[PDB]
Amino acid sequence: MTSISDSQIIVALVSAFITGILALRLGKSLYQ
Amino acid sequence: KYGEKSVYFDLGEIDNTTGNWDLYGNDDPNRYNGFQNKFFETFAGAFTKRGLLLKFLVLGGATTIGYLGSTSSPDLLAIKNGPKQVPVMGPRGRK
Amino acid sequence: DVAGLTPCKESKGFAKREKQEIKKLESRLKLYAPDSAPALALNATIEKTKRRFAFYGNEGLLCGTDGLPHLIVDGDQAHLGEFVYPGLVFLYIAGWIGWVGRAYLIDVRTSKKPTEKEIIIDVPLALRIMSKGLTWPVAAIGELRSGKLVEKSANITVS
Amino acid sequence: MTASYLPSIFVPLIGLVFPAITMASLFIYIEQDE
Amino acid sequence: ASRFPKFSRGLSQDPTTRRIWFGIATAHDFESHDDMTEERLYQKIFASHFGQLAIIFLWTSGNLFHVAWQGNFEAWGQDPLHVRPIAHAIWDPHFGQPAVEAFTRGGASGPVNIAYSGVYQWWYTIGLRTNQDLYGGSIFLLFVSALFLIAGWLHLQPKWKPSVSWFKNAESRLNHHLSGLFGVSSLAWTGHLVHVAIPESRGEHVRWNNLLTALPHPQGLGPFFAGQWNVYAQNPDSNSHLFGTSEGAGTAILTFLGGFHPQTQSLWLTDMAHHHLAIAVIFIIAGHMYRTNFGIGHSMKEILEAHTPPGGRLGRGHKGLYDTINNSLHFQLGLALASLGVITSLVAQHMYSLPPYAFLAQDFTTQAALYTHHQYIAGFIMTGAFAHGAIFFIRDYNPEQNKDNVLARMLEHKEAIISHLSWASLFLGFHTLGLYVHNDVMLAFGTPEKQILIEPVFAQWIQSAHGKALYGFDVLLSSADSPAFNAGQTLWLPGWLDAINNNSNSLFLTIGPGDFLVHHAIALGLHTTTLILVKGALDARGSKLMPDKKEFGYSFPCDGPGRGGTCDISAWDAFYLAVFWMLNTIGWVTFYWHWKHITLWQGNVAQFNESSTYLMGWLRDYLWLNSSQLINGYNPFGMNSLSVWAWMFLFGHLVWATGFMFLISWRGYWQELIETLAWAHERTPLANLVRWKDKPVALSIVQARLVGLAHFSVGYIFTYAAFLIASTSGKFG
Amino acid sequence: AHSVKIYDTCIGCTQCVRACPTDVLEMVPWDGCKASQIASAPRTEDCVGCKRCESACPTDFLSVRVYLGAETTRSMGLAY
Amino acid sequence: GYLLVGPFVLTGPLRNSAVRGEAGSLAAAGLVTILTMCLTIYGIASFKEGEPSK
Amino acid sequence: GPKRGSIVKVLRRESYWFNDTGKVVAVDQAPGVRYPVVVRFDKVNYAGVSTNNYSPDELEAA
Amino acid sequence: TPPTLNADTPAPIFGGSTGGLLRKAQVEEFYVITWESPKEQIFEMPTGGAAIMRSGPNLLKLARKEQCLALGARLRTKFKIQYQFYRVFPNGEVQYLHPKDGVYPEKVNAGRSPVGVNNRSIGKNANPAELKFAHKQAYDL
Ligand code: CLA
Ligand code: CLA
Ligand SMILES: CC1=C(/C=C/C(C)=C/C=C/C(C)=C/C=C/C=C(C)/C=C/C=C(C)/C=C/C2=C(C)CCCC2(C)C)C(C)(C)CCC1
Ligand code: SF4
């Protein structure tokens, strides 16, 4: 019986932000 | 448009020739009161710059929308009020 | 029998359908005078339905679960009349019409103005060609073997 | 729903603020001369 | 280069709104960009493929996270047959209170969406049990997507950029891809199954903490290295086994039972384990085929050259095809798309009849949705295969290098191919429509015994050859004296025969005259779509009407009104025309599948068996009959949970209708209308203060065709999806 | 910025030049045909792409060809 | 801004509640903000710092 | 080139009458004419004409 | 020939229309067509409507080259009237355009050089695959 903690949501959001930064870098490399 | 005769083409007057007129433009400099202008130039002049205006608009809109969405009372929004009735069972007894 | 299909005469559902249709027709008949024209027409329809059901039952047709006849086309000797015989008759007729059309086109091709005969048909020549189509398979095989059926130098586009 | 208030912030954001910013930026980008 | 289309000068210098449209529409076609070299093309493609992988993995991670956060995965796991899975929560400010009450399904505390993707069954079958498992999977997939983004950025750097010769190493790439990406991946999946998922279905709990100590078998790896491979199949699961518990659970890990698990009505897990293990072995062996740095193996060019029939019936054979395929990316893309379309159709056909996931085949709506989804995907993929093959003929084909080989000799008898395809299409169309109309007339006149009902005896004979004992053909697996039956009577045939003689599942459903007529309509659709696509591909380089089409590219509007008129003359237009036929064919297929399964699930198969032989039967007993609860989603008396599906139904009808406007009305009308609008704007007070930057123009001819086809396809898909979901969820039976 | 090409199968009947609505084509002295003249396309910057010249050309296949290309305010036929 | 207030207050989701005026005024102010953003981006896209006047 | 009244077969690949027989009308004997032979056909092409000019090396003697 | 100049000649008698010049003429080129008439006649304006041409020189402002050429073609084939037209730029530059060397384009004239002529049949053009990763178009060769 589990329900996902709030700190887990914080970790997921931070990881998503880092992945978005990486995607921005890749898109910039593709454009240039 | 030289205008002397049926001549409407004139390289000297190319704005008349191409019909580049101001139909209703009025150039009288006196419109408002001096103190009105003082007050409005003092207060409304802050938003003259456009990049700062963009940044302020975006930040203010985001903040206002988030604050209203996350602090709206249940008696106004039905989505925040939530369900109030007993749930209905599915066709084959599936919930 | 084949694919678990029962014969129409043995089947129940064929007879049920016949009974239902006759009952509906008689229910319609109940509204008219015995000697009037509508009564005669309805009676004629009833007799035609009876004759049709008797013929279908006696001809040897297989019947499904729903009570309707089914057809077998895999080549079975007991069901040649369902597909193979009408297929041969159609093939004969269609070959006849196609062969006589081709012969008329070939005969018209060498004329003073082929397009005029193409829109306005030369009736005597057409009738002669049409009558000569009885033995079309023999002539078709003859021209196939004689090398006068196909062409070799035809217009094509840039490959 | 561990948070249960996050949608009330994220849905308005992604639905209104994100499209406005992205459309303004794209309109500025395509309407250039460089 | 200066303006928005940085890759195109002609589009950059365009003063109209056409610039934006065409800059969007040609952005991802790298061969047409200015100053494009082969090396840059290959590297850009490689990085874009990395980006696509990252997007896919983020999509999967998002599914996992949203299900773990807002879904009742554990409650569903406790009672799979009585709980509705939850896809994602709803936060719509535009709702009213009745909608909030109506959408509170499951055990949720607010409005939610019921999932019809089947990921609950798939995740439950593979050992996932709690929400922490789903959260860990979501975080791991986030990490994987980040890794692919880093990989793309790195392999675009000047130090790490691969060379053009690296991208053309066909033998080495195929060796690694065949060995690793297939065999080793399936071997690892077998490892997961055996080591984790099979114990889960028997009441065990194996995770990363106890992976190193939990033996998959009581005597692990002893018999495997002792040659006693049969020890791992001694004690399979019992027919009374309860999935997820230890009641009647065996200890075998690689059985070969065949058939279905009685409680879940899905394939055995140990069968799936031996299957993926055998596939892994076969692929790992097949990898060691082509020559590389070690001086052994075959050479694909020499194989292609050697294969050439004497006597010249095939001409020069397969000579010269190696360079043609290696140097053409469109040839490779077409081959890949054709294979992927066939494989997707195979997945769709083989998943509804042999369900692999526990608790599936009882969720009727999920089964229907999965079938329709992957079948539409397959249709689009096939159409794309043919389109990119036509692009190959126009762009990459070199007539001199392909002199008298199979590829050129295909262009050689193209008129014969198109003629015989046209004959097949015409034959099927005439006689099938004739039979349907004849049956309609027979039933209209009240004489249903006069219709032409033809038994599909060939498919019934094949079904009897599989062991179905209903038609009384008694051949092969239906015959107890056959060598095949005797050979297989101990390995797989007990369970397979028990499953195939059961008439409640979808394993080789019984068929009749209606099934015959529908497979024939499907054949008509297939041969006609093939006709259109092949005509477009073969006539792409030129025809009698326009012998120099190859100089005008793949897509162009027309060649003017001269020579009689040349509308819809390019191969792109053949693609455009064939998309309609693809949609129609897939619609026929999905209609047939859905009606047959609705009748099967309601227990009333007689309605299909009787009403499918005439078209009024379809129109009355499928569409009109099953649209009732859909159209009653919201009415003047309130609204149900089907309100969203009714709204989507109307939305689809509307978008489909809107597509007709672009499809029927052409450009000149709209151009003149826009001219009048521009005059109006320039002459309006208080509006002259605002000036456009781009001169407004009407859409292009090809752009109009594309936009019409897009609105059309979106309306088609949304309408049928809404109808399917609503008509299957209102009853769940 | 369309491109108009003339090929050496021209017979110099001058129909394309008469059909052009924007005066893109003109006749030039030549040797190689009985009329001893051939068509030329010097003002291709004014071509709109109507393809009337192609409709007016008598030849198995056209001696004058128009290849549509980059669009310009003159090619788009805009009066505003 | 003065003319915009009426339509948002008399017609709207909260027109029959006890906060109709405030909701309508906030909606009108939001519309004014959106139009200010539109004006800003239009001015950026249309005029440069060197052009005399049009 | 071929004499007047000859029957010739067109060999120009982009011709509408490729692999079709023609009827030679007139041959120009000027030294610099590039397509001097004039051939008339039975059926009209898409543009509606039935006459074309061909080089002597784009025709067959049959 | 020496290209002619422009002057101040009367315009035709026209009552106005909504099909006249727009802002394009102000910020881009516009066209002027000149001709001489022996008598006053009624002709159809290319922009819609009917106008009266004066006796002697005439001058007319039009927005497109196609309008000027259509009006000139009608004048030549219906009234037997010779015409000229020019191109005018906003800064005052005037470009003489239609009878470029004084002879109409359908008449062969000496001193003209071929442009765009290819010395082959249309079927002898190359294949797009041969000119791959090159900027040629297979009809520029
Ligand atoms: C063993 C080493 C190895 C491995 C693992 C790979 C793996 C890969 N290479 Mg590759 N490559 C290799 C060596 C290797 N390569 C070598 C040596 C070279 C140089 C000679 C290259 C050159 C190369 C190029 C040039 C490119 C790749 C690309 C790719 C990726 C293809 C896209 C993909 O994920 O398909 C995944 C495919 C599968 C998993 C196969 C599945 C089989 C079918 C389709 C489905 C069956 C599964 C089952 C039925 C469904 C279950 C699903 C579930 C929902 C139930 C893939 C990750 C491409 C790429 O994307 O770049 C990043 C690319 O452009 N490679
Ligand atoms: C049934 C489908 C359909 C629809 C909806 C339209 C719609 C339209 N057609 Mg049309 N047309 C169609 C089929 C259709 N056509 C077909 C099949 C043909 C071939 C015969 C034509 C031929 C045709 C011609 C020849 C002409 C039109 C014209 C028009 C316009 C009418 C005037 C107007 O602005 O309406 C106003 C109403 C609407 C556009 C629909 C209502 C608005 C909806 C509800 C949405 C609005 C709000 C929306 C949500 C905004 C938010 C968006 C945001 C969320 C992104 C309009 C765009 C005429 C035109 O140009 O108008 C001057 C015209 O001359 N059409
Ligand atoms: C145009 C073009 C193209 C395209 C093409 C295509 C798209 C095609 C397709 C095709 C296809 C799509 C095909 C398919 C096929 C299939 C097949 C051929 C199959 C077969 C099968 C079989 C034979 C089976 C058998 C069996 C059985 C029955 C049972 C069990 C056992 C077995 C397995 C034995 C390309 C790119 C090349 C390029 C060039 C041009
Ligand atoms: S396409 Fe039209 S404008 Fe261009 S050369 Fe031919 S006739 Fe003249």
Question: In this structure, what are the phi and psi dihedrals at residue F67, rounded to the nearest 5 degrees?
Answer: -115, 110
If residue E609 lies in a helix (H) or strand (E), which one and from where to where? helix E605-611
Residue owning tokens 């004969």: C92
Report the DSSP pairing between strands H37-40 and F3-7. unpaired
CA angle G42, G45, G47 (to 5 degrees): 95
* Residue in A with minimal Cα distance to E154: A26
For chain H, what is the domain count? 1
Whether residue C155 and residue H17 make contact (CB cut-off 8 A), yes or no, is: yes
* Residue in B with minimal Cα distance to E683: B23
Q: What torsion do the CA atoms of E348, E349, E355, E361 make, to the nearest 10 degrees?
A: 90
C-alpha distances (whole Å) from H41 to each of C76, C119, H25 are 56, 21, 10
Method: cryo-EM
Instruction: Tell me the C-alpha distance between E290 and E294, whole Å.
Output: 10
For residue E261, how many other CB atoms are within 10 A of its CB?
20
C-beta of residue E258 within 8 angstroms of C-beta of residue E149: no
Report the DSSP pairing between strands E638-639 and I56-62. unpaired
The residues near E393 (Cβ < 8 Å, ≥ 6 apart) are E537, E538, E540, E541, E571
If residue E87 lies in a helix (H) or strand (E), which one and from where to where? strand E86-89
Q: Does H16 touch chain F (CB under 8 A)?
A: yes
Mutate to test the pocket of ligand 1, among E173, E329, E357 (most ligand atoms within 8 A of CB): E173
Residue B55, amino acid: K
* Residue in I with minimal Cα distance to F62: I122
- Closest C-alpha residue for ligand 1 atom 33: E53
Report the DSSP pairing between strands I117-118 and F3-7. parallel
C-beta of residue E262 within 8 angstroms of C-beta of residue E239: yes
Bridge partner list, I35: I58, I83
Instruction: Tell me the C-alpha distance between F66 and E556, whole Å.
Output: 13
Instruction: Tell me the C-alpha distance between E202 and E183, whole Å.
Output: 27
> Which has the closest alpha carbon to F9: I141, H34, I112?
H34
| Resolution rounded to one decimal, in angstroms | 2.7
If residue H59 lies in a helix (H) or strand (E), which one and from where to where? strand H59-60
C-beta of residue E365 within 8 angstroms of C-beta of residue E117: no
- Copy the structure tokens of residue G11: 């017609």
Instruction: Tell me the C-alpha distance between E698 and E279, whole Å.
Output: 56
Bridge partner list, H53: H38
C-alpha distance across the termini of chain H, in Å:
14
Of E48, E51, E138, the CB nearest to A12: E138
Q: How many residues are recorded in chain G?
A: 54
Regarding the beta carbon of E667 and ligand 2, being less than 6 Å apart is answered: no
* Residue in A with minimal Cα distance to D4: A6
Question: In this structure, what are the phi and psi dihedrals at residue I50, rounded to the nearest 5 degrees?
Answer: -120, 140
Helices (runs of H) and strands (runs of E) counted in chain C: 6, 3
- Closest C-alpha residue for ligand 3 atom 14: E342
Residue C18 in 3-state DSSP?
Answer: helix
Report the DSSP pairing between strands E86-89 and E112-114. antiparallel
C-beta of residue I89 within 8 angstroms of C-beta of residue I95: yes
CA angle E291, E296, E300 (to 5 degrees): 30
Residue E89 in 3-state DSSP?
Answer: strand
Residue owning tokens 């930040």: B59
G38 alpha-carbon distance from chain centroid: 10
Query: How many residue contacts between H and I have a Cβ separation below 8 Å?
Result: 6
Q: How many residues are recorded in chain C?
A: 159
Task: Please report residues of E whose CB lies closer than 8 A to that of C6.
Answer: none
Query: Which runs of consecutive H residues, i.e. helices, occur in chain G?
Result: 5-10, 20-46
Chain E contact probe: residue of B65, B71, B79 with most E CBs at under 10 A = B79
Of B58, B65, B66, the CB nearest to D21: B58
Instruction: Tell me the C-alpha distance between E411 and E407, whole Å.
Output: 7
For residue B44, how many other CB atoms are within 10 A of its CB?
9
C-beta of residue E275 within 8 angstroms of C-beta of residue E254: no
Q: How far is the CA of E336 from the centre of ligand 1 (A)?
A: 13
Regarding the beta carbon of F20 and ligand 4, being less than 6 Å apart is answered: yes
Give the range of the structural domain holding residue H26, as residue numbers without chain letter: 1-62
Bridge partner list, F38: F28
The residues near E670 (Cβ < 8 Å, ≥ 6 apart) are E698, E699
The residues near E317 (Cβ < 8 Å, ≥ 6 apart) are E305, E307, E308, E309, E405, E406
Mutate to test the pocket of ligand 4, among F44, F46, F52 (most ligand atoms within 8 A of CB): F52
C-alpha distances (whole Å) from E639 to each of C70, E303, E635, E636 are 47, 67, 6, 8
If residue H26 lies in a helix (H) or strand (E), which one and from where to where? strand H23-27
Residue E383, amino acid: T
The residues near E599 (Cβ < 8 Å, ≥ 6 apart) are E605, E607, E608
> Which has the closest alpha carbon to E7: E33, E42, E39?
E33
Residue owning tokens 């047409």: E32
Q: Write the DSSP string, E112-172.
A: EEE--S-HHHHHHHTT--SHHHHHHHHHHHHHHHHHHHHHHHHHTSTTTPPPHHHHT-HHH
Please name the residues between 19 and 48 in chain H that touch chain C, using a CB distance below 8 Å.
19-20
Residue owning tokens 């130098």: C153
Whether residue C157 and residue E473 make contact (CB cut-off 8 A), yes or no, is: no
Question: In this structure, what are the phi and psi dihedrals at residue E357, rounded to the nearest 5 degrees?
Answer: -110, 135
Regarding the beta carbon of E176 and ligand 1, being less than 6 Å apart is answered: yes
Regarding the beta carbon of E660 and ligand 2, being less than 6 Å apart is answered: yes
Residue H2, amino acid: P
Residue owning tokens 């067509």: I33
Instruction: Tell me the C-alpha distance between H56 and E342, whole Å.
Output: 53
Q: How far is the CA of C123 from the centre of ligand 2 (A)?
A: 57
For residue C23, how many other CB atoms are within 10 A of its CB?
10
Question: In this structure, what are the phi and psi dihedrals at residue F63, rounded to the nearest 5 degrees?
Answer: -90, -15
> Which has the closest alpha carbon to E652: E630, E621, E620, E619?
E630
If residue E639 lies in a helix (H) or strand (E), which one and from where to where? strand E638-639
- Copy the structure tokens of residue E221: 């790896």
Mutate to test the pocket of ligand 1, among E177, E190, E284 (most ligand atoms within 8 A of CB): E177
Long-range contacts of E318-323 (CB under 8 A, 24+ apart): E318/E405, E318/E406, E319/E405, E320/E401, E320/E402, E320/E403, E320/E405, E321/E402, E321/E405, E321/E406, E321/E407, E323/E401
Residue owning tokens 């890759």: E7
Whether residue D1 and residue E69 make contact (CB cut-off 8 A), yes or no, is: yes
E-assigned strand segments in chain F: 3-7, 26-29, 37-40, 64-67
Instruction: Tell me the C-alpha distance between E370 and E363, whole Å.
Output: 11
> Which has the closest alpha carbon to E193: E253, E135, E239, E149?
E253
Task: Please report residues of E whose CB lies closer than 8 A to that of F67.
Answer: 551-552
- Closest C-alpha residue for ligand 1 atom 2: E176
Residue owning tokens 């999905």: E590
Instruction: Tell me the C-alpha distance between E15 and F73, whole Å.
Output: 7
Report the DSSP pairing between strands H59-60 and H51-54. unpaired
- Copy the structure tokens of residue F71: 């669009």
For chain I, what is the domain count? 1
If residue E728 lies in a helix (H) or strand (E), which one and from where to where? helix E701-729
Mutate to test the pocket of ligand 3, among E318, E325, E335, E412 (most ligand atoms within 8 A of CB): E335
Give the range of the structural domain holding residue I117, as residue numbers without chain letter: 1-141
Whether residue E447 and residue C5 make contact (CB cut-off 8 A), yes or no, is: no
If residue E713 lies in a helix (H) or strand (E), which one and from where to where? helix E701-729
If residue H39 lies in a helix (H) or strand (E), which one and from where to where? strand H37-40
Residue H47, amino acid: A
What residue ranges do the domains of chain C occupy? 1-159
- The answer to whether the Cα torsion of E66, E71, E77, E83 is positive or negative is negative
Instruction: Tell me the C-alpha distance between E437 and B55, whole Å.
Output: 68
- Closest C-alpha residue for ligand 4 atom 8: F20
Q: How far is the CA of F48 from the centre of ligand 4 (A)?
A: 6
Instruction: Tell me the C-alpha distance between H19 and H8, whole Å.
Output: 10
Instruction: Tell me the C-alpha distance between C147 and I94, whole Å.
Output: 75
Residue owning tokens 């205006």: B53
* Residue in E with minimal Cα distance to I21: E679
Q: Does I119 touch chain H (CB under 8 A)?
A: no
Q: Write the DSSP string, I51-107.
A: EEE-SEEEEEEES-HHHHHHHHHHHHHHH---EEEEEE-TTS-EEE-SSTTSS-TTS
C-alpha distances (whole Å) from C119 to each of C114, E266, G47, H46 are 9, 68, 71, 21
C-beta of residue E54 within 8 angstroms of C-beta of residue E148: yes
Instruction: Tell me the C-alpha distance between B81 and E42, whole Å.
Output: 55
Task: Please report residues of C whose CB lies closer than 8 A to that of H17.
Answer: 155
Q: How far is the CA of G36 from the centre of ligand 1 (A)?
A: 50
Maximum distance among all Cα pairs of chain H, rounded to whole angstroms: 32
Regarding the beta carbon of E604 and ligand 1, being less than 6 Å apart is answered: no
Regarding the beta carbon of F43 and ligand 4, being less than 6 Å apart is answered: no
Task: Please report residues of H whose CB lies closer than 8 A to that of C156.
Answer: 18-19
Which atom number of ligand 4 is nearest to the Cα of residue F25?
5
Task: Please report residues of A whose CB lies closer than 8 A to that of D3.
Answer: 6, 9
Chain E contact probe: residue of C9, C24, C26, C68 with most E CBs at under 10 A = C68
Q: How far is the CA of E379 from the centre of ligand 3 (A)?
A: 15
> Which residues of E fall in the annotated binding site for chlorophyll a?
653, 661, 669
C-beta of residue I54 within 8 angstroms of C-beta of residue I37: yes
